[PDB]
Write a protein that binds this ligand. Structure first.
Ligand SMILES: Cc1ccc2c(C)c3c(c(O)c2c1O)C(=O)[C@@]1(O)C(=O)C(C(N)=O)=C(O)[C@@H](N)[C@H]1C3
Ligand SMILES: Cc1ccc2c(C)c3c(c(O)c2c1O)C(=O)[C@@]1(O)C(=O)C(C(N)=O)=C(O)[C@@H](N)[C@H]1C3
Ligand SMILES: [Mg+2]
Ligand SMILES: [Mg+2]
Lengths: 172, 177
């Protein structure tokens, strides 16, 4: 396979559904790559660098339709749909919320933040507040997903989502 | 030591801080208790029952001052302080948020929920809404703590980010009164 971060991270996402977060590491992934294993380290210094890219790709795949939208008229709806999409996506992956927890944007992901914030800026949120809104909504969703897992949940999720969104509206 | 679940679960919290959540299980707790280990199985049907009790004890210790408040007139302040206290507490234990994720009240902990909800009922929340408010605030705090644990990053940082969402969430809840 081509030696690129995304190709390796997408192979690791396959390994995640197969073996869980426990079965995902640089060594463990290099083992699933054969002669190409050692190339993994040129792009990821540690497990967390790999998990950051996996986490970003996992949610990019599901949020792409919302990311492509131009001149979003209703930031409330748009943010709510982001959260619902994140929740559905994390629930769809084995250890999805565990993989996401602690992740941060990659360099290429961070370059996409200005576009991500534009619907909120057009709504009246400052650039600084718009980013805090994004981080907060993702963390509320992450907390719901990781807790609702147990070896009503929908109602409780939207109850808190709508309250959060109403409180943000009061800030404008 | 005395053969009670609370003594067993508090020993398991020592194991959590020592070895992390991977070092916590019925078998490993039995090893820690030595000759008294087999007694734990009369009190916990499965690992999750142990984790449920640990998760309650962990936070009860820190929430006790807030739980003792009577005629709480400022439910906003009270709930905000509960969230801040949970956040501080979960961050103070090794794998604290991971231990907590997925836990549910025990029988004896559930008996305390009516008292937990009093400030919220007195503010005008129904019994169902008040419980949902508790769940929501704790899940928000859980998501923050679990995501905080990990160089310059975008945004204002964990404290300001946590408070931003807490205050927004509390304002939205106040809006349905
Ligand atoms: C310190 C720091 C800085 C920045 C972060 C950013 C930009 C995101 C995330 C972060 O966690 C961050 C973070 O922790 C997420 O997790 C997202 O998944 C998310 O929350 C949402 C959303 N709420 O719509 C998205 O649009 C996604 N694109 C992800 C953007
Ligand atoms: C499905 C269901 C039902 C009920 C739950 C309850 C009552 C709590 C918790 C739950 O998770 C629940 C849950 O999941 C917690 O986790 C708490 O730690 C919490 O959130 C707060 C708080 N917000 O003040 C507390 O005061 C604590 N005492 C814990 C009470
Ligand atoms: Mg994130
Ligand atoms: Mg809980």
């Amino acid at each position: 396979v081509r030696l690129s971060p995304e190709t390796f991270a997408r192979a690791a996402l396959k390994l995640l559904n197969k073996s869980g977060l426990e079965g995902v590491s640089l060594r463990k992934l290099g083992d699933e790559l054969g002669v190409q294993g050692p190339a993994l380290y040129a792009h990821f210094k540690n497990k967390q660098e790999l998990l950051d890219l996996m986490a970003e790709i996992m949610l990019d795949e599901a949020l792409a339709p919302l990311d492509a939208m131009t001149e979003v008229a209703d930031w409330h709806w748009w943010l709510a749909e982001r959260a619902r999409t994140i929740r559905r996506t994390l629930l769809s992956y084995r250890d999805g919320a565990l993989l996401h927890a602690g992740s941060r944007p990659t360099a290429d992901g961070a370059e996409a933040i200005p576009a991500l914030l534009r619907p909120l800026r057009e709504a009246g949120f400052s650039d600084k507040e718009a980013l805090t809104v994004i981080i907060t909504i993702g963390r509320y969703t992450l907390g719901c997903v990781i807790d609702e897992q147990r070896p009503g949940a929908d109602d409780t999720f939207e109850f808190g989502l709508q309250a959060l969104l109403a409180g943000l509206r009061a800030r404008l």
